Amino acid sequence: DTTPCCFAYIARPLPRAHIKEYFYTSGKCSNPAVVFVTRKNRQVCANPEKKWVREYINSLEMS
Amino acid sequence: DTTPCCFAYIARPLPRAHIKEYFYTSGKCSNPAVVFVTRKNRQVCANPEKKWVREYINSLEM
Amino acid sequence: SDTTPCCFAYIARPLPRAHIKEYFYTSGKCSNPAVVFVTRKNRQVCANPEKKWVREYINSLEMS
Amino acid sequence: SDTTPCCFAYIARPLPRAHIKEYFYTSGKCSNPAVVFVTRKNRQVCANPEKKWVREYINSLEMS
Amino acid sequence: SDTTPCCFAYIARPLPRAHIKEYFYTSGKCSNPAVVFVTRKNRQVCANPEKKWVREYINSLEMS
Amino acid sequence: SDTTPCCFAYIARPLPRAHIKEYFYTSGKCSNPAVVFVTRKNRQVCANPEKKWVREYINSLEMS
Amino acid sequence: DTTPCCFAYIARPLPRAHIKEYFYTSGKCSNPAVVFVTRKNRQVCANPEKKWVREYINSLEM
Amino acid sequence: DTTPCCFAYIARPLPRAHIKEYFYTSGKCSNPAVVFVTRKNRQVCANPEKKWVREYINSLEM
Amino acid sequence: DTTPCCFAYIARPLPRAHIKEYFYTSGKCSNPAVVFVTRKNRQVCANPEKKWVREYINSLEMS
Amino acid sequence: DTTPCCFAYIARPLPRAHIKEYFYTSGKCSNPAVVFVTRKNRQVCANPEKKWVREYINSLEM
Amino acid sequence: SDTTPCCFAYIARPLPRAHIKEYFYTSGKCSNPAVVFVTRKNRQVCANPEKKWVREYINSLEMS
Amino acid sequence: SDTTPCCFAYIARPLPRAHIKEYFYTSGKCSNPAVVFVTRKNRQVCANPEKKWVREYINSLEMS
Amino acid sequence: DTTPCCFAYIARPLPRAHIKEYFYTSGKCSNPAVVFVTRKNRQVCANPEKKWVREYINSLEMS
Amino acid sequence: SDTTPCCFAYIARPLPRAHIKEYFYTSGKCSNPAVVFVTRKNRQVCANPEKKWVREYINSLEMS
Amino acid sequence: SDTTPCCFAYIARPLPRAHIKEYFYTSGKCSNPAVVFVTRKNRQVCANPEKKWVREYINSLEM
Amino acid sequence: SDTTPCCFAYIARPLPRAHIKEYFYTSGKCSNPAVVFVTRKNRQVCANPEKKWVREYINSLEMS
Amino acid sequence: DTTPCCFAYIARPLPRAHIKEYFYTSGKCSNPAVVFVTRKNRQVCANPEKKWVREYINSLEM
Amino acid sequence: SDTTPCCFAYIARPLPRAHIKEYFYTSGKCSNPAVVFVTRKNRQVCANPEKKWVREYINSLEMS
Amino acid sequence: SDTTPCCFAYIARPLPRAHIKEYFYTSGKCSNPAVVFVTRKNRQVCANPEKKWVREYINSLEMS
Amino acid sequence: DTTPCCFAYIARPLPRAHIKEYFYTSGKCSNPAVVFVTRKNRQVCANPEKKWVREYINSLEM
């Protein structure tokens, strides 16, 4: 199939009450990034090295 | 095949009974914005930083 | 087209409903915010969002 | 062409339908709202929207 | 040219059709509603809408 | 120039066509409808519409 | 050549300082009228029955 | 033929250096008016009752 | 036919080498204006009260 | 019907072999601009203050 | 969705044409340009644009 | 349709000419000016104006 | 030379203060008529059979 | 000048051409149709339409 | 050498006598013999000698 | 003036032209065609057109 | 002085009640003729060879 | 009076000009062509046209 | 879930068609190209594209 | 059945506080790799030859 990637990152932090899923971009991707999924399946990318992203990652996985 | 964005924002808040879905503008464009799509598949963009836009964003998922 | 159409003039009498097929909004960078109706034979008509019949047509067209 | 045509004079007798090719509305910035018909040979004739024959022609022409 | 032509005199004998090139209506601001024919050599002639030959000429020129 | 020229007299002999430059009709308010031809040196000559030679000149001048 | 006639009468009285000459319509005309001609040799029609027209007629010949 | 008239009057007086000739509207039309013609044969309507129109007429005729 | 009018005035002066003819708006119009027509029959509106408009009027008709 | 306008100006000059016609935006417009139309009726906006637009204006009418 | 799909793996055997429904390109900003086919039941399979069989599909799908 | 499309990625390999149907430019408000080609079945592709390949296709297509 | 005639008659009688001279049409004419000339050399046709024309003729010829 | 001049007597010897300046016809109300020439010193001379030299003079004077 | 007046057209209505001042005959070399009357203000009128109305005026004027 | 002047006698000696101010022709109904000259003191004199000196006087007087 | 003569003879006989006197043309004349004078002293010429002239001559002299 | 004066005798001594008031010619039907002078007291005296004094008087009297 | 599944073992006996609901291809980065069927009970099973029965199932599933 | 493996390796080390279990790729695949599993069973691939992977492998098992 298709190996999706993302080359553009959103600027302001996304609301947490809407995030439904969390995963990583593939290793074959040019830029490593984080992909959030909304309650109604909207995907948006973000930069892993930034501070807000890691806190969202830990809060999603600690449940 | 093309990454749409918006560089002009609507002024008066759009009615809620018409909003069907919403998504975000691309990061590579100059201005980040929110795009709503109505029941008749007409797209209109708006500014995320204002209150009614965030209220519409929050209202759809619950 | 590098042109962003706009409208600076509002119609006076309400347009008949049996002809309206579509509707959309003017750009935000426009001088005057307005609503644009499109009839069954692709005729363009301008209207004022603040007026009552405009809200009635907007609500009636979207309830398909 | 940045010219806004308008109407200050209305026709008296209703024009036959076999000649009407298209119709549209005057601009909103116009002094008098009116309807403009265009014939098969692109001759324009003006008419008053408030009259019954004008709305009847609008409804009959816009459908099919 | 800000001049409003009108018609105050009607022809008596039916006009030959092979000469008519265009046709139009008088303005609404006119005293008497009338129809104006123009020949190939730009001669303007007035005509009576109520008569049969005028309506027949109008319909035959606008359909064929 | 608020005068309406007219014609009350008809010529007898047909005028040569190589001299005719233009032609038009008398006004409707006139007592006798007539045709007026104009020569190369802007001399006016009157003629009777009901006779055949007048229609012959009318038809011959209009096809150029 | 052509026998001019007149079927329309002017409404406002014409200024006297402009009138240069005058003549009458032909007898075969539908409506009898008076024809004045100004300094720029343009002819204008007038009604014989009114007083100002006959006074102008009398003033031009004297 | 066609009998021209005038049903709309201009507001600002037209410059004088352009007027070449002038004549009058027909009597049978609803509003009597004055018609000026410029050097490039453009026709413009005017009000006979106004002062500047009569002044232009007098300047052209004398 | 149709009785044209004009409700919008141009800002920058139009080049003179292209103007072919000129006329005035009708008296029945809401705002009196001047209309120029170019060599390719394009019509443009202008404000009579400005100096360049009347100067163009004088330059085209007095030649 | 609709009064088009322009809020964005093109950067690189358009090829002339494609230019078909040109006109101006309405006066009530937010930004005065020049509008070119190509051989297949593609609309392009342009900046009045630069010379290349004036060159196209001069070239199309001559 | 703010995700830009691309292709990092190419299929080897040419796909049958009777199943292909649409075709398009990967985005330019990804590292490797590729061709994307979509089957009638919306299964997407990637292919190499520089290959010979791909060009035949490229020309054949949109033309008639 | 209050959406302003743009393009931020350019294709690498030259496109076949027999498939291009129309062409236009990105808006001036765009971050990067680009040219947009459309295929026979409405597939959109981006390209860089400063290179020769874009002018070759643009000039050859407009010669119609 | 040219032999003038008169084929159309005026209806209302002309004031006498303007008439300076008068003569008759020739006998070979189609319609016999009277021709009045004003002080400013305006030519007018008249009807011999009516009373006002003969009265003016006699009043001018006896003055 | 409400007088209609006529001519009932025709000249015998042909008039010299070097003097003719203008020409016209008698009115239709005239008893006998004739041709009237006008010289440089505004002297009018009558002529017979049925004769050949008279017919030649009109054409020779009217063209160029 | 001088001018020889003649008459080739005869008037229809008899002229009133109160205006006639003098009368004479046309020359013998004339095409048509006629009588010429002259009014109080020197208007000349032609007449037919063989007709009845002329003879009474001729006889009455000389007496 | 219901009198038709004529001429039946022709002069013998050639007349000096320096006195003639105008000229015209005898009427057509006359027995003998002749030419009539008028002197500065308005005396009329007859002459024969068939001789050369009469045409010479006519041409020299009428061309300047 | 001047010697009057006659070159044209009248056709119809002149009425007798008006003739008052008569005399002859000079002998040096081209054609000898008779000249009658009316009661209002206007002269009219006549042909001597005709009978009515001889009748008037004899009737006046007897 | 239809009397034709003539001249059969010419004067011997030249006539003084200070008495001549008017001048004309004898008729063409006359046996001898002559010149006729008229005095201030309306007396006519005959003279020979062939002599110089007569023509000099002619020219001086007609333009003075 | 950035894991790329593969299969290195192919079934021997042809699988019943009435159970297959979907199908896809192995990734290009896979060591062995294969076809993957997915049953109604969400069991994934691989098969060899080179055999005929697999292509028959692919063709029958994508149309009907 | 299907034997999953890995053909792409992550670049930055993943935080350990989320990893709960781990396993190995099959030997028959082209690239041997280690697969980590998060607290909510999200799998991310990594390179066995690298130090951080072995550090997590040894630390979780003790």
Swiss-Prot record, chains B, G, H, J, Q, T:
Residues forming coiled coils: none
- Tell me where the transmembrane regions lie: none
Q: Which cysteines are joined by disulfide bonds?
A: C5-C29, C6-C45
Question: Which residues are recorded with the post-translational modification Methionine sulfoxide?
Answer: M62
Q: What does the UniProt entry list as the effect of changing T3A?
A: No effect on inhibition of activity by tick evasin-4
Reported effect of changing E21A? No effect on inhibition of activity by tick evasin-4
- List the protein's name: RANTES(4-68)
Species of origin reads Homo sapiens (Human)
Upper lineage is:
Eukaryota, Metazoa, Chordata, Craniata, Vertebrata
